[PDB]
Amino acid sequence: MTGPNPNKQAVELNRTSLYWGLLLIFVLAVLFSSYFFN
Amino acid sequence: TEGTNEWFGVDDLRLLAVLFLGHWAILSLWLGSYGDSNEDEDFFGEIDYSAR
Amino acid sequence: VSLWERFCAWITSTENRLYIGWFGCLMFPTLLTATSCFIIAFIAAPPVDIDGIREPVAGSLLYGNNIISGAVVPSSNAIGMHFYPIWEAASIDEWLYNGGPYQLIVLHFLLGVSAYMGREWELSYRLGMRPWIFVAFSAPVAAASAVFLVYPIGQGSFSDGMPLGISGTFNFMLVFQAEHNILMHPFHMAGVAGVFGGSLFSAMHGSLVTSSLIRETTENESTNYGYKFGQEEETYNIVAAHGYFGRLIFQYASFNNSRALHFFLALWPVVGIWITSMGISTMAFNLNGFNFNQSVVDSQGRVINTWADILNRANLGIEVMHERNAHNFPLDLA
Amino acid sequence: KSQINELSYLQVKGTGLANRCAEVVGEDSIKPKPGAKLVDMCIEPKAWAVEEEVGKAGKTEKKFVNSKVMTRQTYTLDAIEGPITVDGGKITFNEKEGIDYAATTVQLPGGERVPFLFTVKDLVAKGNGDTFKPGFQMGGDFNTPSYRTGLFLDPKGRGGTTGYDMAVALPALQLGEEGDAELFGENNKVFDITQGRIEMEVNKVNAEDSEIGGVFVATQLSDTDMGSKTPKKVLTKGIFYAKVD
Amino acid sequence: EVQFGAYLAVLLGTFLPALFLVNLFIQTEARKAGKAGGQDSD
Amino acid sequence: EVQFGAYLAVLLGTFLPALFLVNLFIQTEARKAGKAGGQDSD
Amino acid sequence: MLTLKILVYTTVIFFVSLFIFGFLSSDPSRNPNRK
Amino acid sequence: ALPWYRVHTVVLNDPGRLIAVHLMHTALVAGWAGSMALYELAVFDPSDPV
Amino acid sequence: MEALVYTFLLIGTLMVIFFAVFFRETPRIL
Numbered sequence: 088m089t090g091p092n093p094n095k096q097a098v099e100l101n102r103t104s105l106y107w108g109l110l111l112i113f114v115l116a117v118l119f120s121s122y123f124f125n
Numbered sequence: 126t127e128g129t130n131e132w133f134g135v136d137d138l139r140l141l142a143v144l145f146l147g148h149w150a151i152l153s154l155w156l157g158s159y160g161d162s163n164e165d166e167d168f169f170g171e172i173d174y175s176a177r
Numbered sequence: 178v179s180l181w182e183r184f185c186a187w188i189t190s191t192e193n194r195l196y197i198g199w200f201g202c203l204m205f206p207t208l209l210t211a212t213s214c215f216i217i218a219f220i221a222a223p224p225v226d227i228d229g230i231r232e233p234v235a236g237s238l239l240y241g242n243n244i245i246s247g248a249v250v251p252s253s254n255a256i257g258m259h260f261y262p263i264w265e266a267a268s269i270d271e272w273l274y275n276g277g278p279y280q281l282i283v284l285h286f287l288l289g290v291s292a293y294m295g296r297e298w299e300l301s302y303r304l305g306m307r308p309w310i311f312v313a314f315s316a317p318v319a320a321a322s323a324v325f326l327v328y329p330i331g332q333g334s335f336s337d338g339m340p341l342g343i344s345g346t347f348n349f350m351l352v353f354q355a356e357h358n359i360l361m362h363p364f365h366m367a368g369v370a371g372v373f374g375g376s377l378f379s380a381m382h383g384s385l386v387t388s389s390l391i392r393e394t395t396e397n398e399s400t401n402y403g404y405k406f407g408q409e410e411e412t413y414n415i416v417a418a419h420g421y422f423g424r425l426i427f428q429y430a431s432f433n434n435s436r437a438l439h440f441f442l443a444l445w446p447v448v449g450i451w452i453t454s455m456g457i458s459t460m461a462f463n464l465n466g467f468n469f470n471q472s473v474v475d476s477q478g479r480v481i482n483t484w485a486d487i488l489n490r491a492n493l494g495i496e497v498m499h500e501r502n503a504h505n506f507p508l509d510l511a
Numbered sequence: 512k513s514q515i516n517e518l519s520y521l522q523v524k525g526t527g528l529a530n531r532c533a534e535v536v537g538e539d540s541i542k543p544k545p546g547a548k549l550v551d552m553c554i555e556p557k558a559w560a561v562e563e564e565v566g567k568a569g570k571t572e573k574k575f576v577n578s579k580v581m582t583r584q585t586y587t588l589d590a591i592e593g594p595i596t597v598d599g600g601k602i603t604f605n606e607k608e609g610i611d612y613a614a615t616t617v618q619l620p621g622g623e624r625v626p627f628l629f630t631v632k633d634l635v636a637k638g639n640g641d642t643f644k645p646g647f648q649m650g651g652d653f654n655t656p657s658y659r660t661g662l663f664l665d666p667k668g669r670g671g672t673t674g675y676d677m678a679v680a681l682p683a684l685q686l687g688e689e690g691d692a693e694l695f696g697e698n699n700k701v702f703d704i705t706q707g708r709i710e711m712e713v714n715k716v717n718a719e720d721s722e723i724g725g726v727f728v729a730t731q732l733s734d735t736d737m738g739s740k741t742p743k744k745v746l747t748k749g750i751f752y753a754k755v756d
Numbered sequence: 757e758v759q760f761g762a763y764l765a766v767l768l769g770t771f772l773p774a775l776f777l778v779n780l781f782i783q784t785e786a787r788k789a790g791k792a793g794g795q796d797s798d
Numbered sequence: 799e800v801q802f803g804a805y806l807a808v809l810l811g812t813f814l815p816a817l818f819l820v821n822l823f824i825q826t827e828a829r830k831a832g833k834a835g836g837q838d839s840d
Numbered sequence: 841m842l843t844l845k846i847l848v849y850t851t852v853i854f855f856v857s858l859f860i861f862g863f864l865s866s867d868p869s870r871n872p873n874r875k
Numbered sequence: 876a877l878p879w880y881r882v883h884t885v886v887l888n889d890p891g892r893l894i895a896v897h898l899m900h901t902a903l904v905a906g907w908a909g910s911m912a913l914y915e916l917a918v919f920d921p922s923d924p925v
Numbered sequence: 926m927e928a929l930v931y932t933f934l935l936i937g938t939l940m941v942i943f944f945a946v947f948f949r950e951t952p953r954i955l
């Protein structure tokens with residue numbers, strides 16, 4: 088190895104942006120399912 | 126020809142030059158350190174710690 | 178200073194990630210070739226004439242199998258005991274038909290496992306350890322060489338060798354039962370006692386240590402965090418677990434010595450698998466197990482059945498059905 | 512030859528020599544006697560070809576692609592006996608005994624394995640003239656038996672003269688008036704006999720040694736596994752050798 | 757007749773990206789409970 | 799002929815429990831980076 | 841098929857010679873006791 | 876404190892890990908083209924190329 | 926189509942064997 092990277096950061100996702108990203112996936116799953124099942 | 130009674134499976138003459146250049150190419154590496162040493166230096170141990 | 182001494186210093190260095198050693202010079206090229214041919218022959222390999230009757234048995238995943246049924250098929254009955262490498266096969270298509278990769282995998286396996294065993298010796302020498310972990314590993318090496326090497330020798334063909342698979346294992350065990358009667362043989366009896374006893378004393382020793390652990394944690398965190406690595410304090414009250422088992426059976430049946438205790442855990446399985454692997458070996462040369470068929474008679478002389486006669490009728494069912502086309506003559510001499 | 516007969520058994524084995532027919536030396540004529548009986552006719556093919564649908568530039572006419580044999584050295588026929596009867600117009604041969612079948616398997620492009628029984632059973636040869644000459648050329652029909660004798664058991668355990676006759680691990684197929692008649696073809700095992708046409712051609716004779724030998728060409732039909740598939744036409748070529756006595 | 761690879765498209769198109777976005781939230785709340793130093797940091 | 803509900807059994811039997819065990823590891827390392835107070839806690 | 845065969849006898853007696861001349865390289869003296 | 880759409884900007888001031896990342900996109904592109912072409916040979920049928 | 930799942934389970938099992946050997950949590954004294 089070498090030394091520890093000084094470019095370590097942390098990732099954040101608040102409770103607000105969770106519900107956006109969940110609803111984004113389910114609505115795209117509702118929309119595109121009917122075409123994939125054909 | 127499988128069940129021929131030939132030495133080390135050496136079917137053709139070309140496979141010998143493979144064997145001789147394999148043992149000798151590492152033998153010559155080995156003689157670069159353990160060769161050209163004193164063949165007349167003993168010990169009364171069970172194990173020798175002479176040199177490299 | 179020399180190039181060889183700077184290479185011997187690296188190849189015997191314990192400062193490597195994995196110790197290579199001088200046995201790794203022929204462990205690693207052998208086992209990586211047994212591996213890289215096994216993954217290809219298990220996934221994509223055409224069917225193989227095993228019975229020598231030109232009825233090719235599918236064994237790979239691309240030819241409609243699964244994890245259970247798929248298997249690297251042993252070599253042909255037509256080859257038998259002959260050495261069959263790739264260069265003595267005149268094409269790879271002729272090699273894969275006649276059971277090619279079974280000999281390439283097995284022979285590079287038994288060299289690599291007998292070199293993995295010597296490698297366990299070597300690092301014990303360079304670390305200051307007492308040497309004999311590799312003697313305990315002799316017991317599965319004895320058993321691997323019994324079903325892949327010794328049993329094809331005494332039966333005269335690699336086709337009787339063990340198929341590298343899961344359903345092929347149970348084709349091997351049942352046909353070995355009908356032709357050799359392994360269950361009545363006292364060396365399979367001495368290793369069933371080796372692994373029933375081995376799994377007993379494993380879970381019996383592992384419970385008495387975990388029973389007598391010392392308080393070093395709270396009830397919220399894990400039990401295992403009361404052991405700091407490399408500590409010098411003993412992590413369990415061994416007097417406590419001795420007084421428990423000294424009352425659970427009686428007093429004199431308990432090892433107070435932890436060294437003699439941890440030796441008996443290594444004795445019992447390993448001796449049980451040395452003896453068992455020399456059961457397959459002595460039954461490779463058709464010295465079968467016991468045969469008590471028609472042993473109990475009345476005074477009139479009529480045969481009174483026993484449990485061995487019921488066991489015989491199970492052996493007669495597998496004997497008349499194994500290799501149902503390969504036989505032409507009334508006695509399975511092979 | 513007699514050169515092969517010089518050797519002992521330990522010098523031939525493992526060398527692939529016993530597979531190969533002899534090489535006759537020289538050319539002359541030999542006359543078949545009234546009681547003339549053919550002694551050591553061996554046939555060995557040197558090339559194989561299976562009739563397929565070939566991928567030409569734009570067309571798909573049927574052509575022969577060749578193939579690689581996969582059973583190793585087990586293809587040669589040997590020890591084929593038979594009397595040579597003299598019809599007036601043309602000399603004839605009818606084989607009687609000897610090893611006259613050699614089962615083998617060749618592989619196509621694509622990975623398809625085509626087994627076929629290579630045989631000369633019940634051969635009626637007819638050739639121009641009376642005496643064997645370097646221009647002599649005889650041939651005729653032979654009967655191919657099936658590749659499997661009827662007591663062969665398939666993976667389910669079904670044969671023509673033994674075994675079951677239904678899908679033994681599918682017990683709900685024989686329910687109803689129809690039964691299992693949807694898979695009827697894979698239950699009925701039919702022994703099949705087809706025809707084959709070999710064409711031999713003598714070109715080198717010894718009369719001082721009474722042994723002939725030349726090039727043949729044989730066509731026949733591959734196997735079907737008792738009606739499991741459509742058999743395919745198999746052409747082969749090679750060399751033979753015979754002792755005319 | 758529907759395509760049987762569409763069940764694998766939809767139910768992994770739901771679950772695999774949605775279980776991803778849950779993970780970025782759980783480690784967000786763990787860092788906030790990590791710095792806070794009381795009863796949950798450990 | 800295979801059962802087409804087995805693809806949903808296996809590929810969710812892999813992914814759903816295996817993505818679960820990843821989450822317990824990511825929030826474990828986030829709590830350790832949360833308490834540590836340097837460059838990653840936030 | 842006689843070109844592959846040449847390649848194997850190279851690779852075998854390469855590593856076999858590393859094995860043979862490995863233990864001839866004063867191998868008992870390579871212990872953590874002394875030297 | 877990075878948002879989820881800025882997580883891969885830790886490689887801006889790090890050339891040594893700029894390569895290890897660009898090698899990992901390469902190991903996925905090359906592993907695709909190998910495993911796609913293995914998938915296509917199990918599906919291809921050279922019976923009639925006309 | 927069926928054997929594609931079996932292959933993915935096998936090489937996926939060999940991945941986590943690779944990461945467990947080389948990326949192991951190295952134990953340390955003190």
Ligand code: CLA
Nearest residue numbers: 133203206207210261262263280281284288848851852855
């Ligand atoms: C280095 C480890 C190693 C070892 C031990 C083997 C061993 C073997 N391989 Mg393998 N192989 C290896 C690496 C290895 N392989 C690698 C890295 C590859 C990838 C290229 C292959 C690829 C490969 C293929 C593709 C095939 C083999 C095959 C074989 C077998 C026969 C090969 C042969 O003729 O050996 C040559 C051996 C010798 C000439 C003998 C050397 C022994 C020396 C001389 C020591 C003896 C000392 C002597 C007795 C002292 C006498 C003193 C005197 C005074 C009397 C054999 C089991 C074949 C096989 O298994 O087919 C079934 C086969 O087809 N191998």
Ligand code: CLA
Nearest residue numbers: 200203287288291292294295296298299311859863864867
């Ligand atoms: C089954 C494998 C095996 C293993 C793991 C060991 C392990 C050991 N042997 Mg040993 N040995 C064996 C078989 C084995 N032996 C056999 C069969 C013989 C008789 C030929 C010997 C003769 C022998 C002597 C004379 C010495 C050792 C020594 C040693 C120790 C150090 C390793 C060393 O330098 O030996 C080198 C390794 C060998 C000699 C055997 C290599 C075995 C290979 C890896 C696998 C088996 C292949 C087969 C036997 C070779 C056939 C070749 C042929 C096909 C061409 C170690 C405990 C040394 C020691 O410490 O003694 C105190 C020592 O001086 N062994």
Ligand code: CLA
Nearest residue numbers: 317318320321323324350351353354359368369453454457
């Ligand atoms: C209650 C039932 C019972 C029990 C407990 C046993 C118990 C046993 N039977 Mg037995 N048997 C039974 C019923 C039973 N039998 C019945 C009913 C039959 C008749 C069908 C048989 C027929 C039978 C046969 C025919 C055989 C046994 C054998 C054995 C032994 C197996 C141990 C073994 O092979 O490990 C030993 C370990 C190995 C073989 C593995 C070696 C693996 C090497 C060292 C390394 C492999 C590494 C791997 C590739 C990769 C590692 C992981 C990787 C990711 C790194 C054991 C004593 C076998 C035997 O006698 O011993 C040989 C045997 O051949 N039995």
Ligand code: CLA
Nearest residue numbers: 360361365366367368369370371372373374375377426427
């Ligand atoms: C009902 C419970 C039971 C019991 C008591 C046994 C007992 C036995 N089985 Mg068995 N078995 C069982 C269930 C049982 N089995 C089941 C459910 C199966 C699977 C279907 C098998 C399958 C099986 C196979 C396949 C084999 C056995 C064998 C054996 C024998 C040795 C096993 C052994 O040493 O294990 C290891 C355990 C120990 C070493 C602990 C000690 C066990 C002994 C018997 C108790 C000692 C107490 C002593 C007699 C009393 C005096 C002491 C006193 C002074 C305090 C032994 C007679 C083997 C055999 O045939 O041997 C002849 C054998 O081959 N069994």
Ligand code: CLA
Nearest residue numbers: 098773776877878879880881882883884885886887897900
């Ligand atoms: C050559 C290609 C390339 C490269 C190397 C980058 C590199 C970068 N972009 Mg950029 N970008 C690109 C193309 C590229 N971009 C394109 C084409 C667009 C238009 C869509 C954008 C739009 C864009 C925006 C709007 C932003 C960036 C940002 C960034 C930086 C961080 C990326 C990040 O955090 O994402 C992390 C991403 C994730 C954690 C998950 C993303 C999930 C995606 C949406 C779906 C999954 C991807 C899918 C599997 C890919 C299939 C392959 C397909 C591309 C063929 C980084 C310097 C950010 C920036 O400016 O840095 C401060 C930013 O805010 N990019």
Ligand SMILES: CC(C)=CCC/C(C)=C/CC/C(C)=C/CC/C(C)=C/CC/C(C)=C/CC/C(C)=C/CC/C(C)=C/CC/C(C)=C/CC/C(C)=C/CC1=CC(=O)C(C)=C(C)C1=O
Nearest residue numbers: 378381382383385386415418419422426430431432433438
């Ligand atoms: C008066 C009237 C009415 C008349 C009728 C007469 C009458 C009263 C009759 C009744 C009498 C009657 C039958 C009573 C007898 C009672 C009796 C014994 C009945 C039970 C019957 C029976 C079959 C018993 C025999 C079975 C038995 C219990 C066998 C014991 C087996 C045995 C000896 C095992 C030892 C195995 C062993 C060596 C284990 C140690 C190895 C091991 C790894 C242990 C782990 C371990 C051990 C340690 O040591 C310590 C330290 C630690 C750390 C540790 O890990």
Ligand SMILES: CCCCCCCCCCCCCCCC(=O)OC[C@H](CO[C@@H]1O[C@H](CS(=O)(=O)O)[C@@H](O)[C@H](O)[C@H]1O)OC(=O)CCCCCCCCCCCCCCC
Nearest residue numbers: 367368370371432434436437438440441444445446448449
């Ligand atoms: C009708 C014929 C009658 C029988 C005839 C005899 C035939 C041959 C019998 C062979 C006897 C061999 C004696 C070996 C002694 C020995 O091992 O000591 C090793 C130590 C020494 O004891 C330890 O010894 C130490 C004292 S000292 O070393 O002994 O001085 C002490 O510190 C320690 O506490 C103590 O545990 O003992 C132990 O650690 C316990 C293991 C005992 C093993 C013996 C049982 C036999 C093997 C099990 C059966 C096979 C297993 C597989 C079965 C499938």
Ligand SMILES: CCCCCCCCCCCCCCCC(=O)OC[C@H](COP(=O)(O)OC[C@@H](O)CO)OC(=O)CCCCCCCCCCCCCCC
Nearest residue numbers: 099100101104105107108110111114773776877878879880
């Ligand atoms: C092969 C591997 C497959 C990889 C797939 C994995 C990635 C998949 C998921 C990533 C995308 C996640 C999007 C997160 C979403 C997210 O977290 O939002 C938050 C994000 C930015 O938020 P901030 O900058 O406030 O973030 C602060 C940080 O603390 C957290 O981000 O917003 C966006 O990036 C743009 C807004 C998109 C928000 C969606 C708007 C559309 C609303 C939904 C519309 C549907 C309803 C329609 C009704 C008609």
Ligand code: OEX
Nearest residue numbers: 336337356500509510511
């Ligand atoms: O190869 Mn496998 O199994 Ca031994 O027995 Mn004889 O050979 Mn065949 O029969 Mn039974």
Ligand SMILES: [Fe+2]
Nearest residue numbers: 382383386439
């Ligand atoms: Fe212990």
